[PDB]
Design a protein around this ligand. Structure first.
Ligand SMILES: *[C@@H]1O[C@H](CO)[C@@H](O[C@@H]2O[C@H](CO)[C@@H](O[C@@H]3O[C@H](CO)[C@@H](O)[C@H](O[C@H]4O[C@H](CO)[C@@H](O)[C@H](O)[C@@H]4O)[C@@H]3O)[C@H](O)[C@H]2NC(C)=O)[C@H](O)[C@H]1NC(C)=O
Ligand SMILES: *[C@@H]1O[C@H](CO)[C@@H](O[C@@H]2O[C@H](CO)[C@@H](O)[C@H](O)[C@H]2NC(C)=O)[C@H](O)[C@H]1NC(C)=O
Ligand SMILES: *[C@@H]1O[C@H](CO)[C@@H](O[C@@H]2O[C@H](CO)[C@@H](O)[C@H](O)[C@H]2NC(C)=O)[C@H](O)[C@H]1NC(C)=O
Ligand SMILES: *[C@@H]1O[C@H](CO)[C@@H](O[C@@H]2O[C@H](CO)[C@@H](O)[C@H](O)[C@H]2NC(C)=O)[C@H](O)[C@H]1NC(C)=O
Ligand SMILES: *[C@@H]1O[C@H](CO)[C@@H](O[C@@H]2O[C@H](CO)[C@@H](O)[C@H](O)[C@H]2NC(C)=O)[C@H](O)[C@H]1NC(C)=O
Ligand SMILES: *[C@@H]1O[C@H](CO[C@@H]2O[C@@H](C)[C@@H](O)[C@@H](O)[C@@H]2O)[C@@H](O)[C@H](O)[C@H]1NC(C)=O
Ligand SMILES: *[C@@H]1O[C@H](CO[C@@H]2O[C@@H](C)[C@@H](O)[C@@H](O)[C@@H]2O)[C@@H](O)[C@H](O)[C@H]1NC(C)=O
Ligand SMILES: *[C@@H]1O[C@H](CO[C@@H]2O[C@@H](C)[C@@H](O)[C@@H](O)[C@@H]2O)[C@@H](O)[C@H](O)[C@H]1NC(C)=O
Ligand SMILES: *[C@@H]1O[C@H](CO[C@@H]2O[C@@H](C)[C@@H](O)[C@@H](O)[C@@H]2O)[C@@H](O)[C@H](O)[C@H]1NC(C)=O
Ligand SMILES: *[C@@H]1O[C@H](CO[C@@H]2O[C@@H](C)[C@@H](O)[C@@H](O)[C@@H]2O)[C@@H](O)[C@H](O)[C@H]1NC(C)=O
Ligand SMILES: *[C@@H]1O[C@H](CO[C@@H]2O[C@@H](C)[C@@H](O)[C@@H](O)[C@@H]2O)[C@@H](O)[C@H](O)[C@H]1NC(C)=O
Ligand SMILES: *[C@@H]1O[C@H](CO)[C@@H](O)[C@H](O)[C@H]1NC(C)=O
Ligand SMILES: *[C@@H]1O[C@H](CO)[C@@H](O)[C@H](O)[C@H]1NC(C)=O
Ligand SMILES: *[C@@H]1O[C@H](CO)[C@@H](O)[C@H](O)[C@H]1NC(C)=O
Ligand SMILES: *[C@@H]1O[C@H](CO)[C@@H](O)[C@H](O)[C@H]1NC(C)=O
Ligand SMILES: *[C@@H]1O[C@H](CO)[C@@H](O)[C@H](O)[C@H]1NC(C)=O
Ligand SMILES: *[C@@H]1O[C@H](CO)[C@@H](O)[C@H](O)[C@H]1NC(C)=O
Ligand SMILES: *[C@@H]1O[C@H](CO)[C@@H](O)[C@H](O)[C@H]1NC(C)=O
Ligand SMILES: *[C@@H]1O[C@H](CO)[C@@H](O)[C@H](O)[C@H]1NC(C)=O
Ligand SMILES: *[C@@H]1O[C@H](CO)[C@@H](O)[C@H](O)[C@H]1NC(C)=O
Ligand SMILES: *[C@@H]1O[C@H](CO)[C@@H](O)[C@H](O)[C@H]1NC(C)=O
Ligand SMILES: *[C@@H]1O[C@H](CO)[C@@H](O)[C@H](O)[C@H]1NC(C)=O
Ligand SMILES: *[C@@H]1O[C@H](CO)[C@@H](O)[C@H](O)[C@H]1NC(C)=O
Ligand SMILES: *[C@@H]1O[C@H](CO)[C@@H](O)[C@H](O)[C@H]1NC(C)=O
Ligand SMILES: *[C@@H]1O[C@H](CO)[C@@H](O)[C@H](O)[C@H]1NC(C)=O
Ligand SMILES: *[C@@H]1O[C@H](CO)[C@@H](O)[C@H](O)[C@H]1NC(C)=O
Ligand SMILES: *[C@@H]1O[C@H](CO)[C@@H](O)[C@H](O)[C@H]1NC(C)=O
Ligand SMILES: *[C@@H]1O[C@H](CO)[C@@H](O)[C@H](O)[C@H]1NC(C)=O
Ligand SMILES: *[C@@H]1O[C@H](CO)[C@@H](O)[C@H](O)[C@H]1NC(C)=O
Ligand SMILES: *[C@@H]1O[C@H](CO)[C@@H](O)[C@H](O)[C@H]1NC(C)=O
Ligand SMILES: *[C@@H]1O[C@H](CO)[C@@H](O)[C@H](O)[C@H]1NC(C)=O
Lengths: 433, 124, 120, 120, 120
């Protein structure tokens, strides 16, 4: 009657977890292959596939690769252990505005030199957040990380610029891309295509406001693992950017010393001119329109005849209650209570005060700390807010979240899935040997 | 309605050549194998030749094997037969027929479903 | 027309693009990439080994001498080869695949011995 | 008579040493050497896959059904097999190669469908 | 019935489990394990290449055109296929193996050139 016929090269695939590799044009390795330009995207006319962000292993690989590469870049850099001494800190002899009182201290200490028997007196300007007083009323302070792990100075030649990385599949595997403009991160996607390699993703690291990501094609999309579970974060993708202008308006003179045999330490020597607080500007009208759109979409998940309230984060350390980001190499911690203070019921700008830290932990880890060299001159950066990370408490109250970096990466990788190709299979025919 | 229409030749001399053709409509031409069946005026039916739906495989009754060529054009919905050396014994009606073979992923046939009107070929 | 372009098409159409997919099966920081390449190669070789065992080496379409017990799938040639896509078919005869592979292996062994005892 | 010993000889002579060359295709510090081994294997497998696609699996000399368009090289047999060396031949038809490979693949796809439609 | 289960059986019995063993040939810390996998692949490929050179590609039992010189083993069939295990046979033709492989290669090359000269 019918016989088994074996076919090889059958267009069938199964979900699979494999290793992806990097393709690009220092956030390189020089081990990323060249992009292999203009990737091809076969449309798969009648393929519907099931996607499930949050269970997507591509996120885990991006997370692990970024952390590993980050740590690798510090391996050859100077260890600042000669600086764990009792710093004698006094008030800065300059014109300080009210917003900056107590923010900077002028600290003197004895540093090591190129020779084992020679010592040098060094003074520098530190941000208050980087030091901890050991004496009660005394001017004796110590660096924040001399009781926990030693601080590594980042190499001054290595930038933190978020250069895009494309993730490519190994032979035998394929990456499927969801093109449904209204896709909410899970479930069937009616329009799926095959990319050889993903688009480049910029590894921008930030907390509560996502910067320089992709925008939604048509409307604000709210994605969450479980929208009624207050233990979950809500990722909101905007369809329009909100432009944010950040500055550190203080002309920084950077000086250096030797602390050992080819080991140099960089520090702020002095400030030219007045001392002002770092800050970021968000256009007021643009921001209010943006929230109105977010609220309209939240009302589709929550009651319609409801009240939506925005509020500032309730607690935790500076790393989780503020908007943390890298602006020109400096690490800013901006207060967003000026953005999330409103209730929505059924040429001005907003200025966000910012704090600066030189000694940071980056990742949510205990045993590592990095010293970011201060940057010469004045810093200005402009970026796009492309999405928000919110958490939820009648009336629904939402607050900024985003402490877990995997959420930043989910906002870009949500449209991709990795599958394994299984070209061998059988079917009945009327053909026999 | 399925139609097969022969638009062939007429009266020819022995040893020469004559070409037949058949136009088809009302079905997907390319989905079916086709054949020619012959009927002399005083005789029954005889199978002459068979061609696969993609045009790759041809079969012939041995009596015409070295003389006839069967072909196909799926763009023009046309079946054709070129006969050479025209034997006197080849005088007959030549019918365009649909069926006689399938393609291993299709249900089998081994019978003819549709017939044309028949071209009359005469050899003097 | 490219890799997996036929994935949404019917089996009777998709079967004509077998070479398109076949040609896309081949080709410490950096170690994980070598590990992936080695495993991709081993996977490839295992598929080739099965085709070898079943007597389908060197071809993309291979007919066999094993019949189709209707208990695996009682659908007729029309429904399989002119409606279903390969993805849907694979999800039907997923449970009854190891059985089929075992039968194909046994059939080829019987064929090899008989052939040898005929060239004797 | 060793590896590439026939490189300076004519095509009609060199063709008798195909096994001499075929057997010499197979066999942090040390990673680069692993990369070389893996790539040598992938290269080998791609050529074997290609012979399989064309229906030349398992053999060093394979005749096909693709005819020689004279536009690729109008030299006659006594000029190709009695004088030219494989190195000079390769240079002469190097840019009409990926046309020939495409034709060989298409020919085999047609050949496979016709044999299945005949085993019915 | 498992891997090498027939190792203690006679050659005429062991020849029926060839697929059992064939399927068990395929599947800084970790470098030596990666090297082992790469080398296992190269070993496998050399054996497959060799079967191809002899014209045995794709089959577990390959008859050839080379005769058995009694000077290699003057035992009869009922003393090789009924009274000996493959392990004991291997340690009897061990120092005539390269001779046989060379003859098999020559036989296949002659057959390939003769087949091509017959397709004209
Ligand atoms: C979101 O995207 C925007 C747009 O890409 C991005 O803003 C860009 O930031 C870079 C880095 O701060 C700016 O590049 C600088 O341009 C000035 C021009 O005067 C140069 O002098 C700078 O060179 C010095 O500093 C470098 C270190 O950054 C050293 O490596 C170099 O040797 C010099 O000492 C440097 O080239 C770029 O101009 C802006 N682009 C715009 C339009 O403003 C923003 O940072 C991204 N946001 C986030 C959070 O990633
Ligand atoms: C930080 O303290 C240092 C001293 O430890 C100040 O440097 C001295 O400034 C006076 C002028 O008031 C000069 O005459 C000295 O020669 C400077 N000493 C050295 C070693 O350079 C420095 O000005 C203070 N800076 C700030 C911002 O308060
Ligand atoms: C840097 O070293 C000098 C020399 O040791 C310190 O000056 C002495 O400090 C001690 C207290 O640590 C006093 O008892 C001495 O009277 C000081 N002598 C002199 C020469 O002034 C200086 O205090 C050290 N600086 C720091 C950061 O403590
Ligand atoms: C962010 O907004 C502030 C206003 O809050 C801008 O500050 C003004 O800058 C002009 C520059 O010509 C000065 O003349 C004004 O006196 C400043 N205003 C105040 C209140 O001091 C700032 O320039 C904006 N731009 C950013 C962050 O890039
Ligand atoms: C951002 O700035 C606001 C002030 O505008 C801070 O809010 C105050 O926090 C204290 C301490 O808990 C309360 O007693 C005040 O009542 C709060 N003020 C208002 C207007 O609500 C807020 O803590 C700052 N947030 C961050 C992350 O720095
Ligand atoms: C056909 O299958 C019949 C049922 O037995 C089994 O269950 C089905 C669902 C399949 O999994 C099959 O492989 C199992 O054997 C058998 O009773 C019958 O003997 C089988 N016939 C043939 C042709 O082998
Ligand atoms: C093929 O069968 C069609 C109806 O399918 C029926 O249900 C499926 C699930 C199978 O069990 C099948 O065997 C059953 O017959 C008919 O509509 C169709 O015309 C049939 N086509 C033919 C005759 O090939
Ligand atoms: C033979 O070649 C003729 C010219 O081929 C053209 O140029 C070569 C280099 C290729 O680019 C080819 O694709 C171009 O068409 C053709 O016009 C002619 O049809 C070919 N004949 C055969 C036998 O197919
Ligand atoms: C083969 O050709 C020799 C000269 O070749 C000529 O030029 C080449 C490029 C071709 O176009 C070829 O056809 C031309 O004839 C002749 O000297 C020789 O006699 C020819 N031999 C044969 C067997 O025809
Ligand atoms: C068989 O082989 C003989 C040559 O082989 C000799 O003996 C074998 C065992 C090896 O030791 C080899 O190195 C020796 O050279 C020939 O005398 C004899 O003619 C051959 N017989 C046949 C049937 O060809
Ligand atoms: C095969 O030979 C068997 C045993 O014969 C003797 O022992 C071998 C090792 C040699 O030394 C030989 O010269 C001796 O005669 C026989 O028992 C057996 O019947 C033979 N079988 C056949 C079918 O020829
Ligand atoms: C420092 O501040 C005082 C007011 O307290 C002001 O009179 C003086 O001019 C300022 N210094 C400079 C250099 O402007
Ligand atoms: C030094 O700064 C502190 C704030 O950290 C302030 O309370 C103190 O009064 C200031 N002392 C002098 C002399 O300016
Ligand atoms: C370092 O000391 C501070 C108090 O100044 C304390 O809060 C912190 O937990 C200590 N860190 C470690 C690793 O003991
Ligand atoms: C996303 O869409 C799917 C459609 O099947 C729905 O089940 C799921 O609840 C939606 N997610 C959210 C956060 O509403
Ligand atoms: C979502 O969260 C609610 C919390 O009450 C829980 O009852 C429900 O089962 C959860 N649903 C899913 C799909 O996780
Ligand atoms: C940011 O700077 C641009 C000029 O580069 C200016 O047009 C825009 O208005 C500024 N945005 C805000 C919020 O001040
Ligand atoms: C934001 O938009 C709403 C709706 O139009 C309006 O009532 C509210 O006053 C606006 N707020 C600001 C600060 O513009
Ligand atoms: C929610 O409110 C919008 C705006 O008035 C309306 O279009 C929509 O139909 C309402 N949905 C429900 C379930 O009431
Ligand atoms: C929120 O706005 C009110 C004015 O309506 C203001 O009094 C209050 O301080 C603001 N809260 C925050 C955290 O900015
Ligand atoms: C800082 O001051 C120096 C004074 O010599 C000047 O040359 C430099 O341009 C200033 N930098 C900025 C960013 O204003
Ligand atoms: C913000 O988005 C606009 C979209 O038109 C783009 O042109 C601009 O370059 C983006 N800004 C940044 C800093 O990437
Ligand atoms: C997708 O389905 C349509 C019928 O709705 C059909 O015409 C088209 O050819 C199918 N696409 C593919 C790749 O088979
Ligand atoms: C598709 O399924 C229908 C219903 O079972 C069947 O009649 C038809 O023959 C199948 N395929 C085709 C188009 O031949
Ligand atoms: C295959 O097995 C699974 C698990 O027992 C079962 O859910 C499914 O219905 C079976 N499918 C078929 C086609 O028998
Ligand atoms: C090299 O060329 C000479 C003629 O000059 C020829 O006799 C010899 O056989 C050629 N060598 C090889 C390896 O073919
Ligand atoms: C070319 O071939 C002819 C015939 O075999 C031979 O006589 C001649 O020497 C050859 N010339 C070259 C350059 O090899
Ligand atoms: C292609 O090859 C021919 C013959 O070797 C040569 O004449 C032509 O210039 C080549 N074209 C290119 C692309 O170099
Ligand atoms: C071992 O030898 C005995 C006869 O003494 C036989 O029955 C048994 O099957 C043999 N076992 C194997 C693995 O060949
Ligand atoms: C080997 O087998 C043969 C045939 O069965 C037999 O005659 C001979 O005695 C056996 N020799 C032994 C026991 O090794
Ligand atoms: C060759 O092998 C045979 C059988 O194992 C053995 O008897 C002979 O001594 C061996 N010869 C050499 C040179 O080892």
């Amino acid at each position: 009657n019918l016989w088994v016929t074996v076919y090889y090269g059958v267009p069938v695939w199964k979900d699979a977890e494999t290793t992806l590799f990097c393709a690009s044009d220092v956030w390189a390795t020089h081990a990323c292959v060249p992009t292999d330009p203009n990737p091809q995207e076969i449309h798969l006319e009648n393929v519907t596939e099931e996607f499930n962000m949050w269970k997507n292993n591509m996120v885990e690989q991006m997370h692990e690769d970024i952390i590993s590469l980050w740590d690798q870049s510090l391996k050859p850099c100077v260890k600042l252990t000669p600086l764990c001494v009792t710093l004698q800190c006094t008030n800065v002899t300059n014109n300080i505005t009210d917003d900056m009182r107590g923010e900077l201290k002028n600290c003197s200490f004895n540093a090591t030199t190129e020779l084992r028997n020679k010592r040098q007196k060094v003074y520098s300007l530190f941000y208050r957040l980087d030091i901890v007083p050991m004496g009660e009323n005394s001017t004796n302070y110590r660096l924040i990380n001399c009781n926990t792990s030693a601080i590594t100075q980042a190499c001054p030649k290595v930038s933190f610029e978020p250069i895009p990385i494309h993730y490519c599949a190994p032979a035998g595997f394929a990456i499927l891309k969801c093109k449904d403009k209204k896709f909410n991160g899970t479930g069937p996607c009616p329009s799926v295509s095959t990319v050889q390699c993903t688009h480049g993703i910029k590894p921008v690291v930030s907390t509560q406001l996502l910067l320089n990501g992709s925008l939604a094609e048509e409307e604000v999309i709210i994605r969450s693992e479980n929208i009624t579970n207050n233990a979950k974060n809500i990722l909101v993708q905007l369809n329009t950017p909100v432009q944010i202008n950040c500055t550190r308006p203080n002309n920084n003179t950077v000086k250096s010393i030797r602390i050992g045999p080819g080991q140099a330490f960089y520090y702020t020597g002095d400030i030219i001119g007045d001392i002002r607080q770092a800050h970021c500007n968000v256009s007021k009208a643009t921001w209010n329109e943006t929230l109105g759109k977010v609220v309209k979409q939240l009302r589709k998940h929550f009651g319609n005849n409801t009240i939506i309230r925005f509020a500032q984060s309730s607690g935790g350390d500076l790393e989780v209650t503020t908007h943390s980001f890298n602006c020109g190499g400096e690490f800013f911690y901006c207060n967003t209570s000026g953005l999330f203070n409103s209730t929505w019921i059924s040429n001005d700008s907003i200025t966000l005060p910012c704090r600066i830290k030189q000694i940071i932990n980056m990742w949510q880890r205990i045993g590592q700390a990095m010293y970011a060299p201060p940057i010469q001159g004045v810093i200005r950066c402009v970026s796009n807010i492309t999405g928000l990370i919110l958490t939820r408490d009648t009336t629904e109250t939402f607050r900024p979240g985003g402490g877990d970096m995997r959420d930043n990466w989910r906002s870009e990788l949500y449209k991709y899935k990795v599958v394994k190709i299984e070209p061998l299979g059988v079917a009945p025919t009327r053909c026999k040997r | 309605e399925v139609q097969l229409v022969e638009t062939g030749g007429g009266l020819v001399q022995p040893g020469g050549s004559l070409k037949l053709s058949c136009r088809a409509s009302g079905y997907t031409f390319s989905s079916f194998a086709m054949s020619w069946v012959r009927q002399a005026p005083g005789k029954g039916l005889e199978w002459v030749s068979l061609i696969n739906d993609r045009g790759g495989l041809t079969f012939y009754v041995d009596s015409v094997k070295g003389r006839f060529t069967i072909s196909r054009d799926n763009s023009k919905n046309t079946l054709s037969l070129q006969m050479h050396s025209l034997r006197d014994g080849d005088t007959a009606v030549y019918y365009c027929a649909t069926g006689g073979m399938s393609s291993a992923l299709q249900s089998s046939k081994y019978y003819f479903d549709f017939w044309g009107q028949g071209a009359l070929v005469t050899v003097s | 027309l490219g890799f997996l372009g036929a994935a949404g098409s019917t089996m009777g159409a998709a079967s004509m693009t077998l070479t398109v997919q076949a040609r896309n099966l081949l080709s410490h920081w950096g170690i994980k990439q070598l590990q992936a390449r080695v495993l991709a190669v081993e996977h490839y070789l295992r598929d080739q080994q099965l085709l070898g065992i079943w007597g389908c080496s060197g071809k993309l379409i291979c007919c066999t001498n094993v019949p189709w017990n209707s208990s695996w799938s009682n659908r007729n040639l029309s429904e399989i080869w002119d409606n279903m896509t390969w993805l849907q078919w694979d999800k039907e005869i997923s449970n009854y695949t190891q059985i089929i592979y075992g039968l194909l292996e046994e059939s080829q062994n019987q064929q090899e011995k008989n052939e040898q005892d005929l060239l004797a």
